[PDB]
Amino acid sequence: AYLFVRLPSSFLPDEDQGVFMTMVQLPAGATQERTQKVLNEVTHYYLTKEKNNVESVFAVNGFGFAGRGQNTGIAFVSLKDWADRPGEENKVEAITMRATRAFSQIKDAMVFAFNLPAIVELGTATGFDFELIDQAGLGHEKLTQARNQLLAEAAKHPDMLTSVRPNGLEDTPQFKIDIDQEKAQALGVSINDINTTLGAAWGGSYVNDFIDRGRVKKVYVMSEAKYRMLPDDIGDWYVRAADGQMVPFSAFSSSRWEYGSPRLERYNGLPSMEILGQAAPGKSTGEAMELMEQLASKLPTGVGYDWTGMSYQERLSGNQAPSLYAISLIVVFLCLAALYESWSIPFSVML
Amino acid sequence: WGGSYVNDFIDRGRVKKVYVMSEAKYRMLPDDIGDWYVRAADGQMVPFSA
Amino acid sequence: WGGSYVNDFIDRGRVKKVYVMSEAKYRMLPDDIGDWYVRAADGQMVPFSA
Amino acid sequence: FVPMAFFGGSTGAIYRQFSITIVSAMALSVLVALILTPALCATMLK
Amino acid sequence: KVNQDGSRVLLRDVAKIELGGENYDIIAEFNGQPASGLGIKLATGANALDTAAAIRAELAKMEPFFPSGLKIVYPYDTTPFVKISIHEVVKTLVEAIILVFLVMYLFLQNFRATLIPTIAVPVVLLGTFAVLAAFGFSINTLTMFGMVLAI
Amino acid sequence: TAAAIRAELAKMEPFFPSGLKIVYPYDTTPFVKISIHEVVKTLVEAIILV
Amino acid sequence: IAQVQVQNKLQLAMPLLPQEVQQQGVSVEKSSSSFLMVVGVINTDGTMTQEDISDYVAANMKDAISRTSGVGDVQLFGSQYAMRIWMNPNELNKFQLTPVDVITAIKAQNAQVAAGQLGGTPPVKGQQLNASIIAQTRLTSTEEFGKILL
Amino acid sequence: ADAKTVQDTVTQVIEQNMNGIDNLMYMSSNSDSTGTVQITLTFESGTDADIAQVQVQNKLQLAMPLLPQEVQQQGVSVEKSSSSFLMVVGVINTDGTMTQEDISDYVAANMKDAISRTSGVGDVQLFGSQYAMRIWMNPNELNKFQLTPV
Numbered sequence A: 001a002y003l004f005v006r007l008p009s010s011f012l013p014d015e016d017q018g019v020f021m022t023m024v025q026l027p028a029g030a031t032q033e034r035t036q037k038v039l040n041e042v043t044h045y046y047l048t049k050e051k052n053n054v055e056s057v058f059a060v061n062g063f064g065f066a067g068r069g070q071n072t073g074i075a076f077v078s079l080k081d082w083a084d085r086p087g088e089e090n091k092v093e094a095i096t097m098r099a100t101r102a103f104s105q106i107k108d109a110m111v112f113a114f115n116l117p118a119i120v121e122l123g124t125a126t127g128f129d130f131e132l133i134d135q136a137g138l139g140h141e142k143l144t145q146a147r148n149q150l151l152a153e154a155a156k157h158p159d160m161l162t163s164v165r166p167n168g169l170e171d172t173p174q175f176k177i178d179i180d181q182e183k184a185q186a187l188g189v190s191i192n193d194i195n196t197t198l199g200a201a202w203g204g205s206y207v208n209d210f211i212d213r214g215r216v217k218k219v220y221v222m223s224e225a226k227y228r229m230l231p232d233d234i235g236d237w238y239v240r241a242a243d244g245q246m247v248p249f250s251a252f253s254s255s256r257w258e259y260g261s262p263r264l265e266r267y268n269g270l271p272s273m274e275i276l277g278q279a280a281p282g283k284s285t286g287e288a289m290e291l292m293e294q295l296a297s298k299l300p301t302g303v304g305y306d307w308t309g310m311s312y313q314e315r316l317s318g319n320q321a322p323s324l325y326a327i328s329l330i331v332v333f334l335c336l337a338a339l340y341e342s343w344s345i346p347f348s349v350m351l
Numbered sequence B, C: 001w002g003g004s005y006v007n008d009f010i011d012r013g014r015v016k017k018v019y020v021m022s023e024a025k026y027r028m029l030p031d032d033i034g035d036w037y038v039r040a041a042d043g044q045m046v047p048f049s050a
Numbered sequence D: 001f002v003p004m005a006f007f008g009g010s011t012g013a014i015y016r017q018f019s020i021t022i023v024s025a026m027a028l029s030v031l032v033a034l035i036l037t038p039a040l041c042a043t044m045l046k
Numbered sequence E: 001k002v003n004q005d006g007s008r009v010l011l012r013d014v015a016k017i018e019l020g021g022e023n024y025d026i027i028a029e030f031n032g033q034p035a036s037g038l039g040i041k042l043a044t045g046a047n048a049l050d051t052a053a054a055i056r057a058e059l060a061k062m063e064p065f066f067p068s069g070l071k072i073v074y075p076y077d078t079t080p081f082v083k084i085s086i087h088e089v090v091k092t093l094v095e096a097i098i099l100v101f102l103v104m105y106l107f108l109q110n111f112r113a114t115l116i117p118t119i120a121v122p123v124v125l126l127g128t129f130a131v132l133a134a135f136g137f138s139i140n141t142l143t144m145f146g147m148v149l150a151i
Numbered sequence F: 001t002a003a004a005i006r007a008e009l010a011k012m013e014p015f016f017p018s019g020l021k022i023v024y025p026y027d028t029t030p031f032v033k034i035s036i037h038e039v040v041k042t043l044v045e046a047i048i049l050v
Numbered sequence G: 001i002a003q004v005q006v007q008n009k010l011q012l013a014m015p016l017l018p019q020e021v022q023q024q025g026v027s028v029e030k031s032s033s034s035f036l037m038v039v040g041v042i043n044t045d046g047t048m049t050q051e052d053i054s055d056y057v058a059a060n061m062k063d064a065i066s067r068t069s070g071v072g073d074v075q076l077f078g079s080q081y082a083m084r085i086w087m088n089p090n091e092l093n094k095f096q097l098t099p100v101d102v103i104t105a106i107k108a109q110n111a112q113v114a115a116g117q118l119g120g121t122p123p124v125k126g127q128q129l130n131a132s133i134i135a136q137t138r139l140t141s142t143e144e145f146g147k148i149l150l
Numbered sequence H: 001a002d003a004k005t006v007q008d009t010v011t012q013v014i015e016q017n018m019n020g021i022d023n024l025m026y027m028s029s030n031s032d033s034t035g036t037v038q039i040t041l042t043f044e045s046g047t048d049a050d051i052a053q054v055q056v057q058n059k060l061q062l063a064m065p066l067l068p069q070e071v072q073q074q075g076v077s078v079e080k081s082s083s084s085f086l087m088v089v090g091v092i093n094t095d096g097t098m099t100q101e102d103i104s105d106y107v108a109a110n111m112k113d114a115i116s117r118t119s120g121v122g123d124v125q126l127f128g129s130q131y132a133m134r135i136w137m138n139p140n141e142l143n144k145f146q147l148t149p150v
């Protein structure tokens, strides 16, 4: 009765499969050179410290598991054989743990390192997947702050073991360039001519194929690195007008910095915004979920929400257990009754 | 007379079609045809029945 | 020399192709290249040997 | 053993696996009990 | 272009020209040294293990013709676990039928009268695998512990 | 797959602009739910008269 | 399967279709014939009109209905919103212009333009700044479409 | 392309056509500020991937004529795999005789194409890149001689 109720439930036990991953998340828009620094720092920790376990570290900078960018990298750590690693200080369940606190310290950017849950291609990581959604074309701004609201309330209520975060949008400074169509179409310059130039040099162009060593490959016009790094470089590019006279960008352009998103997310066709979070040791997984919805009603108008991933597979599963065990009780009884020829003798073996 | 899909624009955040047509007037009867003038090499608008 | 496929036309209620290429007489030997001229910038026919 | 193969949901096909193996095999036990072990006892024993 | 005088201007005159990557977004390295690699994901519904057999079998065909000192090394890979994994459980499935031969000795005490219960255990099992096969199922972890429990 | 319709429409009601109403004009589905209730009725009567 | 064979044979025709039919339509799908239901939508108080609502449903509720469990096709009674230029020939011919000129102007003044980034793909060893360059952008307001220099 | 422009030009256009797809549960998507869409349709358990993929494709296809030439050019792609890596394959050179530049390229040109064709390999990722003819323009020169990148 108790003991049973004084026991936590679960799905399948984590296992040391002899391989694990390690993320590297830089503060959105940080140079790849800096992302290498982290990666190398990571590489060496494993290779030196855990040297007795880590047999190999394939560190890849630039590769986002759901977010390409300069501010992201991933490391594939493979350990030596299970044999050569006695005791739970040599299982991933701790090798990781230590590494997590080893980084997430001497840093500036966050470095999650973990073993992925066995038999759980999205299943039971006892968190939730709140998707925050815009439903009356509010806009990106509103939704950002509208989520900041929900995010900040969830802070006030830590009274249920939680870690409520977004999936790393966080707008970033970006450089606008407003071409003056008019100034151009008046200086005998064609907008197209302008457009290709800024583009092709600043974001390369894919022209056509060529053959390298019997394989077809691609040709790219683009600027050289050092004539496209800082905004005061747009100075370098002139563009030939119809009178042949070479006009510089600053004669049909103009610019100012601004904030914009380096990642727009949507769910079911609507601009959305994914929020993760959990219930660790404490309240029930459906209690947490509940709270979330309630303050998700507080959020400004036109803002809605929905459940995804694991939090979709909660509100469905067929038909429970002590119900399919009552139909077992009944069915076991009648069987014994059937055998023993009585209603009475069954209670001898069932007890 | 038919209209033409030209571009898309962003309406309140959702991509929508951008057309170009003609008021319903001068787009009905067989003499409306006349009302529309087509420019030329030199620079003169010519009556559609030229 | 190779033939090119311009577009379609309808022949007795059926869409069919329209090809366009040199009559066999002017496309046989290498010494036949000569025959072919191209209108240039200023508008004067130019020979291939050029 | 069978009422757990009727869980359904993402779990269900996890359990459905156990259930099946066990209820088969168990029938092969009952089947063998009547064929192999009865003879094979009276063919080798005491 | 050509220009007034005899001087002509080639592409090379206004741009470095070089063989270089389609895009420099992904720099890798295997223990801090220069690397590259294919990261492979499993076709939806495909059999993890069978597929890996092949990824390897293909690579096999490619090595004989690499350049000077180019080596395949195998960092991350889940495959060998699943293998070692289920096989460990298969071990704890033999040795358990061998350790039922002994307890049928401390209660029976005959060389050839101990078999009759222990030679009707791996009969019942071998036939499950067959019934598994008919009903389309796999030899998976869940399906092995299904048999150890069965013992 | 008609529950789904209304269970979705449900979902997108609250965000409607001032004074927007879903109406259900032509829907064949409450005919099903009756047609079947009736044939259950005849099943009990059928038992009754036996 | 029927869908598939049909789609497989349709491919053999596609090449031979007017490269304008191609440029647009050709759809193969599992047709029915009878609407299961007709969920209609009205306004109680003049804040909305035919075009007003017939676009609410178009751009707010169709996509998700047309995507819900068990749902076949979805015929929308009315039409979604479009930026509408209704041309005047007299005002046109007056300033010496053809609808071309207009289409051109629109194609030129409303359109989203790519433009690379500072601290690009491969950077010069130094380098410590990386962000997007945002060039030309799309026009959103009945008003901005008003100001298209012609 | 920049995140908003990716979205409002590729993404939106694609989603908008996703419909009449059997057993569709939900549909999430990202638009990177690299310039990278990833629309991903999750299907009810038990669904036939082969078909799910078919239907997803038949819709993409209607949109196709609407994506910028630039995006078609790069090739949009529809795959059916697990999010997770089955395995990583490493390639290094022990002479030290090849670069990171070269080993990526060797790999690409010589090893990638067959593994990806291997049945069961739902996705492949190249850690690095194949070569291309790189014309790193210099804009001063370009001016010296009175030439644009056009």
Ligand SMILES: CO[C@H]1/C=C/O[C@@]2(C)Oc3c(C)c(O)c4c(O)c(c(/C=N/N5CCN(C)CC5)c(O)c4c3C2=O)NC(=O)/C(C)=C\C=C\[C@H](C)[C@H](O)[C@@H](C)[C@@H](O)[C@@H](C)[C@H](OC(C)=O)[C@@H]1C
Residues within 6 Å of the ligand: A023, A024, A025, A026, A063, A064, A065, A066, A067, A068, A071, A072, A073, A112, A116, A125, A165, A166, A167, A168, A169, A263, A276, H083, H084
């Ligand atoms: C429970 O899920 C976990 C593991 C899944 O397993 C695994 C194998 O499959 C994954 C799936 C299916 C994802 O969809 C995913 C993801 O969407 C994501 C990151 C992480 N990327 N970071 C690395 C670099 N850079 C690309 C951005 C940030 C991931 O690694 C994964 C991921 C892999 O890890 N998110 C992003 O890329 C973006 C755009 C923004 C995220 C910003 C913040 C920083 C993160 O949200 C932090 C706070 C945490 O949420 C994660 C670290 C989770 O770990 C924990 C402890 O919470 C992780 C999702």
